[PDB]
Design a protein around this ligand. Structure first.
Ligand SMILES: Nc1ncnc2c1ncn2[C@@H]1O[C@@H]2COP(=O)(O)O[C@H]2[C@H]1O
Ligand SMILES: Nc1ncnc2c1ncn2[C@@H]1O[C@@H]2COP(=O)(O)O[C@H]2[C@H]1O
Ligand SMILES: Nc1ncnc2c1ncn2[C@@H]1O[C@@H]2COP(=O)(O)O[C@H]2[C@H]1O
Ligand SMILES: Nc1ncnc2c1ncn2[C@@H]1O[C@@H]2COP(=O)(O)O[C@H]2[C@H]1O
Lengths: 189, 189, 189, 189
């Protein structure tokens, strides 16, 4: 239960930090809920652990932890396993809370998001859920966000930066077509 | 009180460090006073805490912690909330002590400062206080400091590097005019 | 036995991490075996220790820890001691398990491997063991891997990135010929 | 005595590390002596401590800790205090042991050394001591070391990288002449 204790002590610091800065009670509970949803009572120095392993072990772990995500998207499901692994390795797990603005219209976009679980509202009005992704337009155009995207419910997502996006596509150039298709179709709508 | 203990133990190391290097008694008290003013008896690995959160949570925290600063300046008060947030996110909190040279005339300037609280003396003689900023000239010209700026009283400031300054303005180009106006007006004087 | 305890507590976290993510029992034992083979019951913040030393001490340590490796290869054995040291300093120790894909054919190669102990199978069928190296072709061509290389037995290797490879050769340009010879000979086969 | 304990526990790890890698008894005592000379029974996360301070405090500390060094050289003694501070801030304290090769002839030089205390032998035969510096030729030519420099006695030095060297001179261009004079005079000899 060393991981449980790590979470408890770390959360104690967070609580004291919020108290020190006199954050409102409502925000403190929002923080409380975020930690439960995001870490679920346990914490590990993930970077330290994966860093002690080797490439093969790290790739098997990410492929397993993302099995759900992978199964939910034709993008990864029907692709070269090596492509999927390269992509998955670059993903960053993120949890957003109801009402959170994940993307704001008109700003410079430098990341896209893959939905593991949750519902988002795209407003320029439409919704996207499990197995869908968004924010790909700006990674392709390098322009400004074409719409705002807010979390409707709690959202468990994986983000990918434009730099990592292009890095992976350097090795798998033809996979860019998948994102472009989705981008074009949405730009038309 | 884990944060209180962190401060106490950390300060113990500092004291032992100053003793090891035989720093004068007067400087040791200056160090003592600095820690009280800067951390106020508590310490947190701020980077670790904010890093465990998400973008929305981090932005709400910085906007709240800087509410005072924001209210004191037409620059931020009357601007696009997204601009203010982008700027605030790049700021670095710093505390200076009476007599400290924040900026020395003739040197290459790579940062500007926003005054949360305190009084500074600009010498090439004038003073600046709460709600004012300085050091913007060099971020705009990339030249040498046009004057020295010393802390008159204890000063609670937020600094912004030229690189972060230009990064934010890449997204909000027109806000550069605000800094230029102040710069031009002061260059004339 | 502070190092033994470090290993035990660290492994406890790993085990809890694997449990948290519900990894299969078989993979958990694979992880168990990896840690035994790689760290052998002890762990040290190697980077912190070597960083407290100086250049001379670090170089003597790496030359000693790699004495076995050096003796097993004409490349290093008959070369300028300064070259060997520069190279050794850039190496990264890695342990692979039976069946592990060290290199996959057709992918972009950015590293080569020197075999301290173990047997690998090169498949485009041949094997390489103690004292041999592989993955040098892509560091020279900057192209795609000409074959896959799987660990046949447990493998104790030292990897070298293309960037560190070229950095060392900036100081020892003529040593590139050794790698080219091996590359040409294998490309012919 | 938290700093004393830090040293004791850290040294315990070092000793266990050397034992794990089966380093010879003679080298283990060399390591033992190095730690005593370099840290003197105490250790602090220097980077963490100085990082908690501000620019003014850090500059006063470095100027004080290097008071001895500064007094021993016309270079710094008769220069602009701001130049001295900028330089001192970039220095890295290093301890070398008798017989250590600080610089090897013919290699690419990327750093120079200022002697706080100790004696070095320059061999292409001459010696340099307290208040003198060496390794400046390569920082100026970007070529290969014109000679080897070995520690004759224990040496307490401060090194400066070519990059930091040129960075400081960007602000103080005319100080480069001081190093060139010494370089030219030695190249003639
Ligand atoms: N009509 C749409 N249907 C679904 N998603 C959309 C639609 N329009 C825009 N989006 C998504 O909203 C995202 C906003 O940021 P981007 O412009 O980078 O990428 C956009 C698309 O991923
Ligand atoms: N006349 C003035 N009134 C107020 N502030 C000034 C005046 N002159 C210079 N300053 C400030 O002092 C700063 C010194 O560094 P900079 O030249 O970067 O920017 C300068 C201005 O921000
Ligand atoms: N015929 C061969 N005999 C031994 N090794 C080979 C042979 N062919 C390829 N290899 C090695 O397998 C490696 C696969 O990655 P690279 O192409 O970078 O470099 C290749 C060589 O190092
Ligand atoms: N004749 C000399 N007298 C004193 N120092 C020297 C002499 N010749 C070379 N050196 C120093 O030895 C250093 C070796 O590395 P560098 O060539 O970078 O710079 C050299 C000088 O700093």
């Amino acid at each position: 239960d060393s991981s449980r204790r790590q979470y408890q002590e770390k959360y104690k610091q967070v609580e004291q930090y919020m108290s020190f800065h006199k954050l409102p009670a409502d925000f403190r509970q929002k923080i409380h809920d975020y930690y439960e949803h995001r870490y679920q009572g346990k914490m590990f120095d993930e970077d330290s652990i994966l860093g002690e392993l080797n490439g093969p072990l790290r790739e098997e772990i990410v492929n397993f932890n993302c099995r759900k995500l992978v199964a939910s998207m034709p993008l990864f499901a029907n692709a070269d396993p090596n492509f999927v692994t390269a992509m998955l390795t670059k993903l960053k797990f993120e949890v957003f809370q109801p009402g959170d603005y994940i993307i704001r219209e008109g700003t410079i976009g430098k990341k896209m998001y893959f939905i593991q679980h949750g519902v988002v509202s795209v407003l320029t009005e439409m919704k996207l859920s499990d197995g869908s992704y968004f924010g790909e337009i700006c990674l392709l155009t390098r322009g400004r966000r074409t719409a705002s995207v807010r979390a409707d419910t709690y959202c468990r997502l994986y983000s990918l930066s434009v730099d990592n996006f292009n890095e992976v596509l350097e090795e798998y150039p033809m996979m860019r077509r998948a994102f472009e298709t989705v981008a074009i179709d949405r730009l038309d709508r």
